[PDB]
Copies of this chain bind each other. A is one copy, B any other.
């Protein structure tokens, strides 16, 4: 297996890395581990103007006021248990959002703030028959309503909820109230079941309280039952949200129709569906184990055919200190991070199942030292029934001495490991910023990108509609539209000239500049920066982009093209002339 990608060679896989607390998504080539692109999502990107432009702020909605995000869990949409390459979805734990990235243009095209919850952490996708739902955990228990009268986590109206988003519309589909809380989540290969770990069955707020119980659980959702209750109208709504809310809590020991709680030790974390569809595998964290839930025993669990919820556990291998996450090679082996022992443990799922029945067998095949304190790990295609067992990335939280010193803040160490053979081979240490938690790989042929925008792309269709109200044809026009104290500049552009190279406004006018890159040559992107006004955006081939700012300073103000586009790039500039307020009518 080739490890190094030389000049002129291409990588074999795309990697989509979470940006962690930095808030973006990063596209890597694998196995080179080089970063090919950054996709802004919850961060504000100076380069493309994401968070500044009108198109991006429209997608972000009211949450455009936040300049931060905290993303952990990138996942690719699937059809019949295989990636279909349409969308990447990712969480925001900081401001409680889910974002969608369109993989043909490699941009965030939709974003939603999940209502009546705090902190979207775990996130994964329905696999079968396709990604109808995005499943997202809200991690923190809060009051309902959260109006400041009640703060007690033990109140009967304090809880968190499991969240289903319609992947295509990016509107809420339903929410399920649960006991305890929600950490990570995964889905089966039938569409009936999803599952989530809980570490706060105690509903505590202090460290000791959250570790009190010997077992928490993974909660299992019967999605068929949830859908059935929604269609029957058997649900409530919270606050001003129209999202159907179903009650998945136990009441006086009787189970809900929507949920079953499988006791699992202890403050469990990772929740990973095996690629053969057989198991939800929960990482025991404070317990030195993983718990294997047999997915084919869940219908019987939901039909009272089992005496004890633990009867759906068919394995609980002891693996090492601090199990956090598990991935799969498609050959019947699982790979689990041990945070405390600082290792990846490779183990055979069917032998662990046999040892659980007493048959003394050594299911542990290898322990590889990683550097250091691994969190998530990811094997290529692990989330599909095409898991190919080639590459493994372990994403470790302390890099210590593995890279040159760069001051008190250290990079993370995402290590590429060869798993095509019986023996795990550490091949590359990849330093990364801001703590990617997880990542996802896709074959090169699973991703199909556009090299030039379509003119009807929904990403800027609202801007096209605005332009139409002014009588503008964006493909041809270079016009300055005036409307009271608003000025709307529309221009085409082609290297190395802006189609409108000067315009004049009054001091205090609100200026919108809309630019259409009317060339069709791949890689010839333009920028637009207004000096000393905090204005910057990208305009790639056939894109329309727009940005709005106040001309608060009299005098002449240069704008220029920021993206090197031509040998005359330094010369692709223009001038905004601002007439002073004392020369125009005076308002208070």
Complex formed: what's the CA distance from A415 to B449 in Å?
24
Chain B hits for A11, CB < 8 A: 403-404
Chain B hits for A1, CB < 8 A: none
- Binary interface profile of A, 383-422, with partner B (CB < 8 Å = 1, else 0)? 0000000000000011110111111111100010000000
A524-580: which residues lie under 8 A (CB-CB) from chain B?
524-525, 527, 529, 531-536, 538, 540-543, 553-558, 560, 562-565, 567-568, 570-573, 575, 577-580
Chain B hits for A452, CB < 8 A: 408
Complex formed: what's the CA distance from A438 to B541 in Å?
25
Are the C-beta atoms of A411 and B37 separated by less than 8 Å? yes
* A118 CB-CB contact with B under 8 Å: yes
Are the C-beta atoms of B529 and A93 separated by less than 8 Å? yes
Chain B residue with the shortest CB-CB distance to A524:
B398
Are the C-beta atoms of A431 and B104 separated by less than 8 Å? no
Tell me how many residues of A have a C-beta within 8 Å of chain B. Answer: 151
Are the C-beta atoms of B65 and A534 separated by less than 8 Å? yes
Residue from B7, B33, B199 in contact with A428 in the complex, judged by beta carbons closer than 8 Å: B7
Chain B residue with the shortest CB-CB distance to A521:
B398
* A348 CB-CB contact with B under 8 Å: no
Complex formed: what's the CA distance from A183 to B569 in Å?
12
Given contacts A35-B431, A525-B408, A564-B435, contact A558 B119 (CB under 8 A): yes
Complex formed: what's the CA distance from A42 to B45 in Å?
11
Are the C-beta atoms of A570 and B199 separated by less than 8 Å? yes
Chain B residue with the shortest CB-CB distance to A38:
B433
- Binary interface profile of A, 130-153, with partner B (CB < 8 Å = 1, else 0)? 000000000110110111110101
Complex formed: what's the CA distance from A35 to B21 in Å?
17
Are the C-beta atoms of B7 and A430 separated by less than 8 Å? no
Chain B residue with the shortest CB-CB distance to A340:
B567
Are the C-beta atoms of A70 and B580 separated by less than 8 Å? no
Chain B hits for A400, CB < 8 A: 522-523
Complex formed: what's the CA distance from A139 to B535 in Å?
18
* A210 CB-CB contact with B under 8 Å: yes
Are the C-beta atoms of A21 and B210 separated by less than 8 Å? no
Are the C-beta atoms of B46 and A531 separated by less than 8 Å? no
Given contacts A96-B531, A140-B573, A556-B151, contact A36 B501 (CB under 8 A): no
Min C-beta distance of A54 to chain B, whole Å: 15
Chain B hits for A207, CB < 8 A: 496-497, 568, 571-572
* A243 CB-CB contact with B under 8 Å: no
Chain B hits for A244, CB < 8 A: none
Min C-beta distance of A113 to chain B, whole Å: 8
Are the C-beta atoms of A556 and B36 separated by less than 8 Å? no
Are the C-beta atoms of A580 and B69 separated by less than 8 Å? no
Given contacts A46-B42, A205-B502, A534-B95, contact A433 B37 (CB under 8 A): yes
Min C-beta distance of A582 to chain B, whole Å: 9
Given contacts A47-B433, A205-B575, A406-B449, contact A554 B146 (CB under 8 A): yes
Residue from B7, B47, B453 in contact with A22 in the complex, judged by beta carbons closer than 8 Å: B47
Min C-beta distance of A392 to chain B, whole Å: 14
Are the C-beta atoms of A554 and B148 separated by less than 8 Å? yes
Residue from B14, B20, B44, B403 in contact with A44 in the complex, judged by beta carbons closer than 8 Å: B44
Chain B residue with the shortest CB-CB distance to A30:
B404
Are the C-beta atoms of B375 and A339 separated by less than 8 Å? no
Are the C-beta atoms of B29 and A46 separated by less than 8 Å? no
Residue from B145, B411, B554 in contact with A147 in the complex, judged by beta carbons closer than 8 Å: B554
Complex formed: what's the CA distance from A107 to B408 in Å?
10
Complex formed: what's the CA distance from A401 to B10 in Å?
9
Chain B residue with the shortest CB-CB distance to A408:
B540
Are the C-beta atoms of A70 and B118 separated by less than 8 Å? no
Are the C-beta atoms of A96 and B532 separated by less than 8 Å? yes
Chain B residue with the shortest CB-CB distance to A120:
B531
Between A44, A52, A65, A535, the greatest number of chain B beta carbons within 10 A of the residue's beta carbon is seen for A44
Are the C-beta atoms of B399 and A571 separated by less than 8 Å? no
Complex formed: what's the CA distance from A497 to B140 in Å?
17
Chain B hits for A468, CB < 8 A: none
Given contacts A68-B534, A531-B96, contact A434 B47 (CB under 8 A): yes
Chain B hits for A49, CB < 8 A: 68
Residue from B206, B286, B407, B430 in contact with A104 in the complex, judged by beta carbons closer than 8 Å: B407
Min C-beta distance of A206 to chain B, whole Å: 7
Residue from B4, B44, B555 in contact with A4 in the complex, judged by beta carbons closer than 8 Å: B4
Chain B hits for A67, CB < 8 A: 44, 46, 51-52, 67, 534
A176-214: which residues lie under 8 A (CB-CB) from chain B?
183, 199, 205-207, 210-211
Complex formed: what's the CA distance from A577 to B42 in Å?
26
Complex formed: what's the CA distance from A15 to B570 in Å?
26
Chain B residue with the shortest CB-CB distance to A153:
B556
- Binary interface profile of A, 1-45, with partner B (CB < 8 Å = 1, else 0)? 000101110110010000011110001010001111110001111
Min C-beta distance of A310 to chain B, whole Å: 24
* A322 CB-CB contact with B under 8 Å: yes
* A444 CB-CB contact with B under 8 Å: yes
* A429 CB-CB contact with B under 8 Å: yes
Residue from B20, B143, B373, B532 in contact with A95 in the complex, judged by beta carbons closer than 8 Å: B532
Are the C-beta atoms of A105 and B269 separated by less than 8 Å? no
22 example contacts (A-B, Cβ-Cβ < 8 A) are as follows A10-B403, A22-B45, A35-B431, A35-B433, A44-B67, A70-B529, A93-B529, A93-B531, A94-B536, A95-B533, A106-B406, A106-B407, A119-B560, A142-B555, A285-B567, A322-B567, A397-B564, A398-B524, A408-B450, A408-B453, A410-B523, A435-B563
